[PDB]
Amino acid sequence: MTTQQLKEKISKIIDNFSGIRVVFTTTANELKLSRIEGSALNSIAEGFIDKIKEDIINNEDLTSPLLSNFDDRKNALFKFDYEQYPEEFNKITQAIAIPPNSQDYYNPLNKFTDVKGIIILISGDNKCLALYKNKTNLAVLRLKQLPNEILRLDFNYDLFSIGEDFYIKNHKTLETQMKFHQVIEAQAVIALNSLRDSLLIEDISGLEKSSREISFARKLAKISKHSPVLGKIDTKTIIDYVSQHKYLSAILQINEAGDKLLIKTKTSQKHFIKLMSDDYLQSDLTKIIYMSIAKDRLDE
Amino acid sequence: MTTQQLKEKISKIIDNFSGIRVVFTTTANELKLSRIEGSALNSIAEGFIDKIKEDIINNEDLTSPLLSNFDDRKNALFKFDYEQYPEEFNKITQAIAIPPNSQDYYNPLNKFTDVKGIIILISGDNKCLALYKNKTNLAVLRNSRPDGYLKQLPNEILRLDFNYDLFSIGEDFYIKNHKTLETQMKFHQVIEAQAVIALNSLRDSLLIEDISGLEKSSREISFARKLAKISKHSPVLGKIDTKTIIDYVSQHKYLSAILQINEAGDKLLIKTKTSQKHFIKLMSDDYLQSDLTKIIYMSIAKDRLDE
Numbered sequence: 001m002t003t004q005q006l007k008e009k010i011s012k013i014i015d016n017f018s019g020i021r022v023v024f025t026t027t028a029n030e031l032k033l034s035r036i037e038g039s040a041l042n043s044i045a046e047g048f049i050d051k052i053k054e055d056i057i058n059n060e061d062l063t064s065p066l067l068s069n070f071d072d073r074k075n076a077l078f079k080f081d082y083e084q085y086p087e088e089f090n091k092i093t094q095a096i097a098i099p100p101n102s103q104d105y106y107n108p109l110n111k112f113t114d115v116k117g118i119i120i121l122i123s124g125d126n127k128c129l130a131l132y133k134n135k136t137n138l139a140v141l142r143l144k145q146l147p148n149e150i151l152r153l154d155f156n157y158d159l160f161s162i163g164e165d166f167y168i169k170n171h172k173t174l175e176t177q178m179k180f181h182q183v184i185e186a187q188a189v190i191a192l193n194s195l196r197d198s199l200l201i202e203d204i205s206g207l208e209k210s211s212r213e214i215s216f217a218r219k220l221a222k223i224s225k226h227s228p229v230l231g232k233i234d235t236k237t238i239i240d241y242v243s244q245h246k247y248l249s250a251i252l253q254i255n256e257a258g259d260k261l262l263i264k265t266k267t268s269q270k271h272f273i274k275l276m277s278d279d280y281l282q283s284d285l286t287k288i289i290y291m292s293i294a295k296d297r298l299d300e
Numbered sequence: 301m302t303t304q305q306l307k308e309k310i311s312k313i314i315d316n317f318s319g320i321r322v323v324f325t326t327t328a329n330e331l332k333l334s335r336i337e338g339s340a341l342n343s344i345a346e347g348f349i350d351k352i353k354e355d356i357i358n359n360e361d362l363t364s365p366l367l368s369n370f371d372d373r374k375n376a377l378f379k380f381d382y383e384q385y386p387e388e389f390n391k392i393t394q395a396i397a398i399p400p401n402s403q404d405y406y407n408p409l410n411k412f413t414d415v416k417g418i419i420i421l422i423s424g425d426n427k428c429l430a431l432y433k434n435k436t437n438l439a440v441l442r443n444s445r446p447d448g449y450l451k452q453l454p455n456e457i458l459r460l461d462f463n464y465d466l467f468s469i470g471e472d473f474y475i476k477n478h479k480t481l482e483t484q485m486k487f488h489q490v491i492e493a494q495a496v497i498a499l500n501s502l503r504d505s506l507l508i509e510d511i512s513g514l515e516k517s518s519r520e521i522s523f524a525r526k527l528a529k530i531s532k533h534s535p536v537l538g539k540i541d542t543k544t545i546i547d548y549v550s551q552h553k554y555l556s557a558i559l560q561i562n563e564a565g566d567k568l569l570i571k572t573k574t575s576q577k578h579f580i581k582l583m584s585d586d587y588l589q590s591d592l593t594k595i596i597y598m599s600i601a602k603d604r605l606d607e
Contacts, residue, residue: 037450061522073601151443233592280590285544
């Protein structure tokens with residue numbers, strides 16, 4: 001369900017707007033219903049529709065790839081391609097379908113320390129577009145500070161769900177608030193056994209020590225599910241490419257035998273990770289080598 | 301002044317922290333000294349590394365390309381390389397240099413509607429890091445009044461924390477959030493003037509037959525920021541002849557279908573937004589093939605290696 005079909009599906013909801021209503025997921029994993037004043041609930045709907053338009057609709061360079069094929073792209077809304085739904089994904093699913101006559105309302109004596117996340121439900125063309133912002137008290141002034149409880153809606157979303165297909169804006173909320181996306185740590189070490197069974201690296205320990213920092217653990221799961229080099233082109237062709245390469249030879253070294261790579265230092269680990277993401281590309285026009293941070297296939 | 305040279309210019313100010321001073325800028329373009337509470341000032345100080353280390357120091361995938369070589373990279377600090385300082389750059393330059401004995405303090409009867417931006421001066425190692433932020437319209441400060449509803453009671457409370465917008469480490473400034481620069485500081489005059497230079501150079505290049513579709517997209521700063529990039533950092537315009545690009549597109553496996561050549565053979569056909577966006581990506585050399593896997597790729601964010 002492509003970038004354009006998203007732009008159709010969202011602008012169907014935005015133009016034939018039917019109703020907004022806000023749900024609190026709490027620490028007890030129950031969806032409690034808000035009591036927002038009308039001109040303040042009109043205050044929520046106007047600015048979200050602009051942010052929805054700014055991020056999706058008339059946004060030209062919107063890019064929707066798979067979450068396992070993560071990289072560092074601005075704008076962009078990542079497709080949830082995994083199968084393990086964190087429980088808050090399913091809480092948003094039940095948040096879509098509270099009946100409108102229900103009275104399980106949020107009691108405001110709880111001082112918004114119960115509020116774990118804020119669910120914005122924007123409905124239109126009979127469907128509903130749910131958005132998610134985690135409870136972020138942040139900081140407000142007046143000079144002194146008195147709230148420490150007062151709710152905050154910064155018109156911003158991390159997670160949103162159109163139908164049965166979830167999309168990702170801020171990747172960090174999907175880990176540090178959602179299960180550390182612990183599939184990633186397991187997907188990183190399935191790749192570490194696959195690098196072990198590739199026998200391309202001599203010592204696998206420095207790669208095993210980068211799997212603690214989650215900034216490398218995403219890059220391992222990228223190569224685990226989406227590599228065009230691991231398991232597809234053989235070991236000796238990779239080594240002969242790196243040796244003949246102009247930039248890659250000075251950093252990655254091959255052992256005395258010539259059959260195993262020497263990836264021990266962090267400077268060599270970052271570049272070898274960018275080797276198995278195929279991020280060392282060349283133009284047929286300018287004949288210049290390049291280092292890709294964000295890229296996409298073309299013949300599909 | 302590279303990425304690592306930014307990283308240790310910051311962690312020199314960071315690991316020898318001296319004092320944090322908060323300056324409000326007005327709509328009268330006069331700087332105003334805040335009155336931050338002491339336990340608030342420590343909670344406002346927050347470390348700030350808690351944001352700054354995660355953007356700079358501990359951030360391994362930190363990238364510092366020029367602002368004029370814009371692309372869509374996250375965890376990225378765009379080095380300001382233009383000649384023109386928008387007036388808040390010059391107000392941040394004076395924001396560093398208020399003497400600490402000065403009594404030009406901010407009067408809080410203004411209800412924070414004169415407040416246009418928020419300057420976080422973070423000083424250390426006798427230098428000063430300065431952060432910039434805009435006063436946005438309070439987001440929503442919804443509070444209670446059992447039967448309790450919710451309402452934006454004050455509608456004047458200053459809402460501020462991290463997610464900074466603009467640097468001032470030395471004179472080489474950096475941009476994290478670029479929309480702040482183009483809209484609140486009014487930088488989009490300089491991008492659109494640079495983009496019109498690009499349209500006249502393509503007109504002189506004679507690679508396209510009609511240029512009107514590029515000029516209808518030139519108002520949207522999305523195309524103008526890609527036109528201002530190609531005006532200043534393309535490895536194709538003027539360096540290679542127009543015919544060689546045409547035989548390369550005519551030979552191509554993807555570009556041959558979208559971008560066409562006229563019936564004569566010397567001019568490219570760029571009219572619809574599809575053929576504009578793909579020729580824009582052709583122009584900044586974003587179509588690259590692997591020397592290993594031999595798969596053609598379309599790059600969003602890239603970097604040279606030879607330099």
